[PDB]
Coordinates of N, CA, C and O and ligand atoms in Angstrom, one line a residue:
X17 N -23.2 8.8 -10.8 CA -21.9 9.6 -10.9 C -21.1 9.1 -12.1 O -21.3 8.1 -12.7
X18 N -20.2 10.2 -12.2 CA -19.4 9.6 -13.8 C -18.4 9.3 -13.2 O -18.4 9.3 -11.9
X19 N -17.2 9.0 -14.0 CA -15.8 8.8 -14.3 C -15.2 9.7 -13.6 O -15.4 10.9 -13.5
X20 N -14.4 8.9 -13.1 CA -13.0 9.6 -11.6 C -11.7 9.4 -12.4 O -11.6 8.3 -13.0
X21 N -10.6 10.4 -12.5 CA -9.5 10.1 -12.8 C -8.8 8.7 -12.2 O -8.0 8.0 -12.7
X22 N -9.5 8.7 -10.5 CA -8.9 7.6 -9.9 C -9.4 6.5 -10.1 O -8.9 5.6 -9.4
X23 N -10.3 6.1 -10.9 CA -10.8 4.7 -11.8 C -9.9 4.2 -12.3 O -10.0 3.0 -12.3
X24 N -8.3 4.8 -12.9 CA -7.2 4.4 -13.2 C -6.7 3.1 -12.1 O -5.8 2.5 -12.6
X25 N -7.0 2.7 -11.4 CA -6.7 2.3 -10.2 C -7.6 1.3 -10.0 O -7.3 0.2 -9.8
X26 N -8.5 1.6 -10.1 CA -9.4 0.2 -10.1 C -9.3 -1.4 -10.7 O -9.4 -1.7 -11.9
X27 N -9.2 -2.2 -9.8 CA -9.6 -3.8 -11.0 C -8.4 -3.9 -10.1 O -7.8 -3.0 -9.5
X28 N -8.3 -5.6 -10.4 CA -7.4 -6.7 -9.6 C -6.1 -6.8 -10.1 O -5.9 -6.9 -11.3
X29 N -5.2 -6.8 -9.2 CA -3.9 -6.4 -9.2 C -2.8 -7.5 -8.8 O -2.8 -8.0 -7.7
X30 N -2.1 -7.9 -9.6 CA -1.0 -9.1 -8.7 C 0.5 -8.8 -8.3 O 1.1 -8.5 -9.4
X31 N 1.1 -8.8 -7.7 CA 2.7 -8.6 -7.2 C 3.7 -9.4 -8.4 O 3.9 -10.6 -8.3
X32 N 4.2 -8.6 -9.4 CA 5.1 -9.5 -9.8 C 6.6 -9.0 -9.4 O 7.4 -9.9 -9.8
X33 N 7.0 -8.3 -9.0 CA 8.5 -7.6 -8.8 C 8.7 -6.7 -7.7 O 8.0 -5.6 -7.6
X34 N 9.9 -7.2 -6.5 CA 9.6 -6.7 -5.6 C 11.2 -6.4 -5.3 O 12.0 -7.3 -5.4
X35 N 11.8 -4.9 -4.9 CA 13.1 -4.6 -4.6 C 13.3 -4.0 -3.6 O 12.6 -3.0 -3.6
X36 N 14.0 -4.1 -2.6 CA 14.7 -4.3 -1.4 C 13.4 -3.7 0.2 O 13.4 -3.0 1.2
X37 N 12.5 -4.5 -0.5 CA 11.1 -4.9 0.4 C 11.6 -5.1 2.4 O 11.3 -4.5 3.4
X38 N 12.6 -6.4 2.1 CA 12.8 -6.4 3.5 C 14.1 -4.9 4.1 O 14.1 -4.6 5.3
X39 N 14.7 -4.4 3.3 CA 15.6 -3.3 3.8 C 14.0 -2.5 4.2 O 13.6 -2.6 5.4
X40 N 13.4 -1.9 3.4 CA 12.4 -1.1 4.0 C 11.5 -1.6 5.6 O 11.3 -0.9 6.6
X41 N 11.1 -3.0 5.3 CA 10.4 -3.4 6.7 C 11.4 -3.2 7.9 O 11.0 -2.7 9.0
X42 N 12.5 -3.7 7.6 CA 13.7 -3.5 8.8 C 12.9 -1.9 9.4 O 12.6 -1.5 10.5
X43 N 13.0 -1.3 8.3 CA 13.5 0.6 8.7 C 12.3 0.8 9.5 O 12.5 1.0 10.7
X44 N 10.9 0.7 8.7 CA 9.7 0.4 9.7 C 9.8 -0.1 11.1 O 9.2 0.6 11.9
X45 N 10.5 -1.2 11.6 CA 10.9 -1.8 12.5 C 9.9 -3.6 12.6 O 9.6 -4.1 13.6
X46 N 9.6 -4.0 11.8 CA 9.3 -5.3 11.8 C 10.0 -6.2 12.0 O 10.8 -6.7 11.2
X47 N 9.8 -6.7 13.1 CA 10.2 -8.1 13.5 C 10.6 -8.9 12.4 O 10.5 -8.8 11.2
X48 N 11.4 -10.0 13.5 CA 12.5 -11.3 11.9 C 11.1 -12.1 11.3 O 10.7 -12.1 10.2
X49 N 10.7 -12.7 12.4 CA 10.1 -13.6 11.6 C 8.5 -12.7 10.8 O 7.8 -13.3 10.0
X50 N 8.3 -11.8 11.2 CA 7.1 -11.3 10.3 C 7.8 -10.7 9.4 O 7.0 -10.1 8.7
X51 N 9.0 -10.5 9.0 CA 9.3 -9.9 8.0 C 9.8 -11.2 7.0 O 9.8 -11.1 5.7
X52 N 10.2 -12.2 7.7 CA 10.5 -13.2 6.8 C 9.6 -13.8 6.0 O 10.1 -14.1 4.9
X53 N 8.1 -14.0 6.3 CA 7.3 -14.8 6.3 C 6.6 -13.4 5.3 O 6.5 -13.6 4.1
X54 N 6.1 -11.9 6.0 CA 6.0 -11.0 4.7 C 6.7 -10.9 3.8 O 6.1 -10.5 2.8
X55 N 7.9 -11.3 3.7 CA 9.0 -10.8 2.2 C 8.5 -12.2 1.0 O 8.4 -12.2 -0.2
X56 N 8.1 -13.1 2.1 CA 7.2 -14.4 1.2 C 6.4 -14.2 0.0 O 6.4 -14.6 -1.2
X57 N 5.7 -13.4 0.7 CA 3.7 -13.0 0.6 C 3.9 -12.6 -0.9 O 4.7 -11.7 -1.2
X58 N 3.1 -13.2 -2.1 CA 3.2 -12.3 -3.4 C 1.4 -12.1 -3.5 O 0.7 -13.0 -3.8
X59 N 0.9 -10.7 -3.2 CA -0.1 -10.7 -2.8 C -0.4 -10.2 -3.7 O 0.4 -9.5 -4.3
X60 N -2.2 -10.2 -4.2 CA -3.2 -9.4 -4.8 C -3.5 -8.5 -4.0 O -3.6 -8.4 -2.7
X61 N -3.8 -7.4 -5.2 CA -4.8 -5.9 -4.4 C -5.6 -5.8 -5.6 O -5.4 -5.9 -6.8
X62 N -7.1 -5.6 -4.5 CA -8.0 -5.5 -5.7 C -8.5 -3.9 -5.0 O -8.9 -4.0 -3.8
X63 N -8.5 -2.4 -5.5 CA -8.8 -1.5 -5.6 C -10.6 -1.4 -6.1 O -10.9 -2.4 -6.9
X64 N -11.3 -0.8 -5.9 CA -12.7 -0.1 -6.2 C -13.3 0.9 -5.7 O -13.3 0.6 -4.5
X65 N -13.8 2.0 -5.9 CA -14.1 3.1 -6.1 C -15.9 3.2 -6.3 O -16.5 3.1 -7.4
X66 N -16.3 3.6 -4.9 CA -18.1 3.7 -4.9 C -18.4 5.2 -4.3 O -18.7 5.6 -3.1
X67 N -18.3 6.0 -5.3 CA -18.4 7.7 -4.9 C -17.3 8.1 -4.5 O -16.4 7.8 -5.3
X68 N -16.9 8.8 -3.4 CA -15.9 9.2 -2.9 C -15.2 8.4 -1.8 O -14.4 8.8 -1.1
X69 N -15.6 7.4 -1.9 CA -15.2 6.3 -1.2 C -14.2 5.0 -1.9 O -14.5 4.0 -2.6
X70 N -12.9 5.4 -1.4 CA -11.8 3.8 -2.6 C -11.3 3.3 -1.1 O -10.7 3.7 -0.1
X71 N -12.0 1.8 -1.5 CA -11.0 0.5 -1.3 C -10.0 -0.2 -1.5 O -10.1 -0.8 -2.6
X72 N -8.7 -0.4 -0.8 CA -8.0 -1.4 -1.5 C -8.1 -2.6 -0.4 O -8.2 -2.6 0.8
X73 N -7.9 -3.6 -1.3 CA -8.1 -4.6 -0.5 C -6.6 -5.6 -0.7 O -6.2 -5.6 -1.9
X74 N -5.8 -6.4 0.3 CA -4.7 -6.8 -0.1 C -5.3 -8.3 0.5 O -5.9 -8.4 1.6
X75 N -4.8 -9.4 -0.5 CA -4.9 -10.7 0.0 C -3.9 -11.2 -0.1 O -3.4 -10.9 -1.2
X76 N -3.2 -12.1 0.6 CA -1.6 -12.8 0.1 C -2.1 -14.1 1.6 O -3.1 -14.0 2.4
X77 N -1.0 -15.1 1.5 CA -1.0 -16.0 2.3 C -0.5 -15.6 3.7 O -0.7 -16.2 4.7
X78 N 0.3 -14.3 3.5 CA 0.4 -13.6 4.7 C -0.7 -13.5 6.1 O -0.9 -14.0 7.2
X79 N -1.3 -12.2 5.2 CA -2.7 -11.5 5.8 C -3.6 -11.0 4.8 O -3.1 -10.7 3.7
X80 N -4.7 -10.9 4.9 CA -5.7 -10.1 4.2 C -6.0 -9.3 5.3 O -6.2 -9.5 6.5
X81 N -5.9 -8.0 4.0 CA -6.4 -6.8 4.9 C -7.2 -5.8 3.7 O -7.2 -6.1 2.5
X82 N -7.8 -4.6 4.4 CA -8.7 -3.4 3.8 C -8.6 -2.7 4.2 O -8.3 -2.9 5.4
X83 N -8.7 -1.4 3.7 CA -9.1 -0.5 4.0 C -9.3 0.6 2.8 O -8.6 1.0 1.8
X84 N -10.7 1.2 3.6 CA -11.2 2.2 2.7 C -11.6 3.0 3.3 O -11.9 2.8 4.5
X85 N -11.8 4.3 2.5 CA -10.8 5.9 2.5 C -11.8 7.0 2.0 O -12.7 6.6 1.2
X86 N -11.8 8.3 2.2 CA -12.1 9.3 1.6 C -10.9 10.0 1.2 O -10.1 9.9 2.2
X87 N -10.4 10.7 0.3 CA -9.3 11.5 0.1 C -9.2 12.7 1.1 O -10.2 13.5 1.3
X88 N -8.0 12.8 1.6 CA -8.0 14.0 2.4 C -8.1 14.1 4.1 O -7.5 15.1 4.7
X89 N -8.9 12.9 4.7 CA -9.6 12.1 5.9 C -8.8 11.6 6.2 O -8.0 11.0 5.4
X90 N -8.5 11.8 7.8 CA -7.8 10.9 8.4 C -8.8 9.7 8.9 O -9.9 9.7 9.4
X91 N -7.8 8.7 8.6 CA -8.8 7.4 9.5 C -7.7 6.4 10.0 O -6.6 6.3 9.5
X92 N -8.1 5.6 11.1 CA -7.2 4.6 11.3 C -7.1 3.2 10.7 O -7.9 2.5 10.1
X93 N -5.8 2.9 10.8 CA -5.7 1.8 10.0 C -4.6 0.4 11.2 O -3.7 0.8 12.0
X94 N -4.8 -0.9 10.9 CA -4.3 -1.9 11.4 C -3.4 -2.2 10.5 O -4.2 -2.7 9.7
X95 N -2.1 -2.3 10.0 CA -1.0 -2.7 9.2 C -0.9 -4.7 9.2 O -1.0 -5.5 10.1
X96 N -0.9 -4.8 8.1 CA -0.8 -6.0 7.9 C 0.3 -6.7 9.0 O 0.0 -7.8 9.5
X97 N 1.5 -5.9 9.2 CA 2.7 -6.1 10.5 C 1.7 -5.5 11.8 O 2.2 -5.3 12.9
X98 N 0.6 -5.3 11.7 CA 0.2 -5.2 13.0 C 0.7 -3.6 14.0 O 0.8 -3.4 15.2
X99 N 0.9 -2.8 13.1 CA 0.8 -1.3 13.3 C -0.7 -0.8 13.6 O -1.6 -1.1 12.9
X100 N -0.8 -0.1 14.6 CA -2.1 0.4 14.6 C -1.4 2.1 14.4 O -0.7 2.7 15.2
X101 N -1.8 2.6 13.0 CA -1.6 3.7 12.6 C -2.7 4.8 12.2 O -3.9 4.6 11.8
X102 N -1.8 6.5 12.4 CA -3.2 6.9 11.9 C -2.7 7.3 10.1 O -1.6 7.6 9.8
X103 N -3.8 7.3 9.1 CA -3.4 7.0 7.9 C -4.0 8.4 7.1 O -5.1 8.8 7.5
X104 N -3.6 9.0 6.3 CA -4.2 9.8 5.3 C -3.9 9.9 4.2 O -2.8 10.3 3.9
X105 N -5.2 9.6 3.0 CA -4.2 9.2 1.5 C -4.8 10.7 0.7 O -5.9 11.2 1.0
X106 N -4.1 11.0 -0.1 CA -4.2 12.2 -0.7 C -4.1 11.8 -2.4 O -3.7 10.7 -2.8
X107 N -4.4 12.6 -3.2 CA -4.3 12.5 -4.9 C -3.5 13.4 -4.9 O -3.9 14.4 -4.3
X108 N -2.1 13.5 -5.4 CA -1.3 14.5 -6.2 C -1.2 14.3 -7.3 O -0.8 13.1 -7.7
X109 N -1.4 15.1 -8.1 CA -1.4 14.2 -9.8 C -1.1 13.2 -9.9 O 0.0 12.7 -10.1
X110 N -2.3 12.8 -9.8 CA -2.6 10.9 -10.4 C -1.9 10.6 -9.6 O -2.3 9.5 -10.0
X111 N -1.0 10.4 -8.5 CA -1.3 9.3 -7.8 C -1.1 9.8 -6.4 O -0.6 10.8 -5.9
X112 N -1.5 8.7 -5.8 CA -2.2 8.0 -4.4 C -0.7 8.4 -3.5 O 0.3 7.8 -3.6
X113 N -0.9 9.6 -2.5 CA 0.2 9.4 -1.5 C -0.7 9.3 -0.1 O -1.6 9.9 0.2
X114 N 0.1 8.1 0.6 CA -0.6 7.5 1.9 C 0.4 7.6 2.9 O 1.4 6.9 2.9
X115 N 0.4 8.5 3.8 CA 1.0 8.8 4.8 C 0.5 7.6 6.1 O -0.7 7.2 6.5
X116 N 1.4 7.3 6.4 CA 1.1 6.4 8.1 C 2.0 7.1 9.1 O 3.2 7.3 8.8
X117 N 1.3 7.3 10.4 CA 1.8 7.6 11.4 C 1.4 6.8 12.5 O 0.4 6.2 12.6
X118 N 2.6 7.1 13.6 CA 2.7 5.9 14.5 C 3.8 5.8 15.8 O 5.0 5.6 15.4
X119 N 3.6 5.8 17.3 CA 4.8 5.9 17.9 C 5.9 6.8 17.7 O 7.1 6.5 17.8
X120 N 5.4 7.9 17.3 CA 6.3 9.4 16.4 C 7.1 9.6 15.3 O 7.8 10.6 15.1
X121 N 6.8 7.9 14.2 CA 7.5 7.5 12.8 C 6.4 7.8 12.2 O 5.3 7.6 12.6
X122 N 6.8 8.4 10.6 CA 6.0 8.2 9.7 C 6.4 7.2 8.4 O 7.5 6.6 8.4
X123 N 5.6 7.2 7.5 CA 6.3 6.1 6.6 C 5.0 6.5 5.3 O 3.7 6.5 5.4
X124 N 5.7 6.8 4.2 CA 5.0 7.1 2.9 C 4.6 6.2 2.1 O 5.5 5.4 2.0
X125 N 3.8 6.0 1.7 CA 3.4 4.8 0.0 C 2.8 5.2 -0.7 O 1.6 5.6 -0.7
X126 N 4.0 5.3 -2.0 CA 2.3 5.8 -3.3 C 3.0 5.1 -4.0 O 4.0 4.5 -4.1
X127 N 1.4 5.4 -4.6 CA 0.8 4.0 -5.6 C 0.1 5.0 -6.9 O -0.7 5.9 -6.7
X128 N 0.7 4.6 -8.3 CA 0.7 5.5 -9.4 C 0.0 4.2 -10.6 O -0.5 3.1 -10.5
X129 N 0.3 4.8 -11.4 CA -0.3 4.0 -12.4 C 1.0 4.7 -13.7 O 1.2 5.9 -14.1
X130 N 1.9 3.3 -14.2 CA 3.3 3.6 -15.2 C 3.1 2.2 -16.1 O 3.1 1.0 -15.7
X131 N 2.6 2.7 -17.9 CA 2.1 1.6 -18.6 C 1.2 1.2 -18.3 O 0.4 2.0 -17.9
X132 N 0.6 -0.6 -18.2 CA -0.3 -1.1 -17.4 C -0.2 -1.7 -16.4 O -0.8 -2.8 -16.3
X133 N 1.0 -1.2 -15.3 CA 1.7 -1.4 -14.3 C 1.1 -0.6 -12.9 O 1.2 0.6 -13.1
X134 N 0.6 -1.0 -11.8 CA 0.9 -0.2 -10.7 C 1.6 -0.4 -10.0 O 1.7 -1.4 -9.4
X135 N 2.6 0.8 -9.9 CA 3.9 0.8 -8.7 C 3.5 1.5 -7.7 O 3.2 2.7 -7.8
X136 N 3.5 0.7 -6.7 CA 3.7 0.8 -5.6 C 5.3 1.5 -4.4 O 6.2 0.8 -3.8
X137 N 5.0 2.6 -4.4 CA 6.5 2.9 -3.6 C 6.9 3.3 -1.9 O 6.6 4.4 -1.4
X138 N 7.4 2.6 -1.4 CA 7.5 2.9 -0.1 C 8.5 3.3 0.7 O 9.3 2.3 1.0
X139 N 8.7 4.4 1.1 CA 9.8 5.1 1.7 C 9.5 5.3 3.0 O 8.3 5.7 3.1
X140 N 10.0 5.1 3.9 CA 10.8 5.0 5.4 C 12.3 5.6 5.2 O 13.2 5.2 4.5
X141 N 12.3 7.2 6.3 CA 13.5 7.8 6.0 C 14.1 7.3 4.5 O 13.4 6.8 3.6
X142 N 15.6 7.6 4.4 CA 16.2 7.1 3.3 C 15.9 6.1 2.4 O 16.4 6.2 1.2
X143 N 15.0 4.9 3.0 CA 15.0 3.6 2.6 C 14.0 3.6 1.7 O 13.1 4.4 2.1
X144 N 13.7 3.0 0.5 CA 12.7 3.1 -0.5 C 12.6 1.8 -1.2 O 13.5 1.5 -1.9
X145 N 11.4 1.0 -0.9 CA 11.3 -0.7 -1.3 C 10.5 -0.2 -2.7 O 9.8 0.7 -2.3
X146 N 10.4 -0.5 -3.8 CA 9.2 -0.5 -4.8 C 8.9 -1.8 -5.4 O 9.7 -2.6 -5.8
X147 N 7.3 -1.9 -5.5 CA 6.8 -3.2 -5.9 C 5.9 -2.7 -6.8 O 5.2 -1.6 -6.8
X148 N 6.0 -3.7 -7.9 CA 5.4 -3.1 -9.1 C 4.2 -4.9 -9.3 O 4.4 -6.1 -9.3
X149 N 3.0 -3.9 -9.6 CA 1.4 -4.8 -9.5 C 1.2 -4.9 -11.2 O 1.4 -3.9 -11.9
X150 N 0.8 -6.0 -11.8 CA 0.7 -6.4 -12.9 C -1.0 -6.5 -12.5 O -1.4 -6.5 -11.3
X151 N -2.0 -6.6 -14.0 CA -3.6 -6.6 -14.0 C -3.6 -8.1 -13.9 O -3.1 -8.8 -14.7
X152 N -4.3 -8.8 -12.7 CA -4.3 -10.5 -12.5 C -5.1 -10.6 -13.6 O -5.5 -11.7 -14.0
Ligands
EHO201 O1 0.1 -4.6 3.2 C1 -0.1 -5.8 2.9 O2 -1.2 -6.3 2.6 C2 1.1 -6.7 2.8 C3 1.0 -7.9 2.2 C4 2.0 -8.8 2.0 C5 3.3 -8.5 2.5 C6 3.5 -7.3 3.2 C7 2.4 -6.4 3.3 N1 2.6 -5.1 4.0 C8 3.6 -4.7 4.9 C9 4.3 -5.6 5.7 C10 5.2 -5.1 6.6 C11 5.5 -3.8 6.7 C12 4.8 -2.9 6.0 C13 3.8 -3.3 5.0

């Protein structure tokens, strides 16, 4: 197979900048101390891409977690806060929107590619945390 626009995305990623992270987890509903102890976490995501099949993988001192996806597919997913949600990630031009649902909430994250930055954006109703991933 050749080249995927979403190859943009691929390769190891580090957390350098993170804004109002714990306002968003509140909105989610995460507990004090997993939210204390996640607002900690400056974690790696290493993304890859084998056919129609993308991985991301998140490591931090938190939790390590994965999961991998076909676009379009719903599949379930375990939340590093311990959500058991159901998940579906979509391509809208160039980037990654991931819907989670759960207990009748949903909660959005996309993840784009700005410079050689991935930002990561997460909205819960009104509330919107963005963390922006530098190439480790
Ligand atoms: O998703 C991860 O791997 C992750 C890693 C470190 C810190 C927080 C993290 N996610 C998260 C935590 C609470 C609510 C929603 C998402």
């Amino acid at each position: 197979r050749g080249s995927h626009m979403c190859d943009a995305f691929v390769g190891t990623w580090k957390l350098v900048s993170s804004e109002n992270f714990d306002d968003y987890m509140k909105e989610v509903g995460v507990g004090f101390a997993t939210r204390k102890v996640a607002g900690m976490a400056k974690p790696n995501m290493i993304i890859s891409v084998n056919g129609d099949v993308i991985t991301i993988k998140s490591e931090s001192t938190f939790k390590n977690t994965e999961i991998s996806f076909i676009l379009g597919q719903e599949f379930d997913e375990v939340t590093a806060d311990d959500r058991k949600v159901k998940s579906t990630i979509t391509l809208d031009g160039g980037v990654l929107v991931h819907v989670q649902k759960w207990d009748g909430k949903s909660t959005t994250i996309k993840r784009k590619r700005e410079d050689d930055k991935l930002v990561v954006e997460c909205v819960m109703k009104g509330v919107t945390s963005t963390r922006v991933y530098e190439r480790a």
